A = this chain, B = another copy of it.
């Protein structure tokens, strides 16, 4: 049906570079010529389209890269796909704000971690006590309490599942009603749990038995 390689075209990146040594469409065009002369002709596919069935995706000077699209690349790679990232990819988010932190900055470090490389910058030279409630249908952490918790927690991962939240009258007094307390997130082929509060051994055992035990 289609080729094994997709060269992703971003209309937003073309709009951004068309307004100085960067040119998204010219970079896509050269990568297309390269794959053509190499005998493995590639397709040109819009970034927003479903390219999950391709074996390789190429992102040449895709300047604008959202966290949602960075997650799609990570999912694509983790499931066995091959991702090729140019030097000028993932520098700015979808709201035209520069990705802070190390280079490349797309996804608050998710793209950087996929590549296994890091640069410092893009540089081209020439309430007292709170009760918890299980968010899933397990009721394992219901009735548990905490006396020291992290207050500023935002669930940002697309595939991050909330396992428990702070609830009750005491939780609402600090504007923490519904705030995430225990979460888990897929990362590559693995997983990462976040425990946002202190728990006694009794409550920890219920957390371990419900999610981390061998049984």
Contact = CB atoms under 8 A, between A and B. Distances in A.
Interface of A: 4-5, 21, 27, 30-31, 33-35, 37-40, 56, 58, 74, 76-87, 100-103, 107-110, 112-130, 146-160, 174, 180, 183, 185, 187-201, 204-205, 207-209, 212-215
Copies of this protein in the complex? 2
Given A115-B193, A119-B151, A119-B153, 15 more contacts: A35-B208, A37-B205, A40-B212, A78-B190, A80-B190, A85-B195, A87-B198, A101-B108, A108-B109, A109-B112, A114-B185, A116-B158, A118-B154, A120-B152, A122-B152
B152 A103 contact: yes
B209 A39 contact: yes
Contact of A187 (B114, B128, B159): B114
Contact of A113 (B27, B122, B148, B187): B187
Contacts of A149: 87, 124-126
Contact of A87 (B35, B190, B195, B207): B195
A83 B191 contact: yes
Mostly helix, strand, loop or mixed at chain A's interface?
Answer: mixed
Contact of A155 (B109, B117, B152, B187): B117
B117 A156 contact: yes
Contacts of A187: 74, 77-78, 83, 113-114, 116, 188
Contacts of A31: 204, 208
Nearest to A4: B214
A173 to B, nearest CB: 10
* Nearest 4 CB-CB pairings of A with B: A116-B157, A78-B188, A109-B109, A116-B185
A76 B151 CA distance: 28
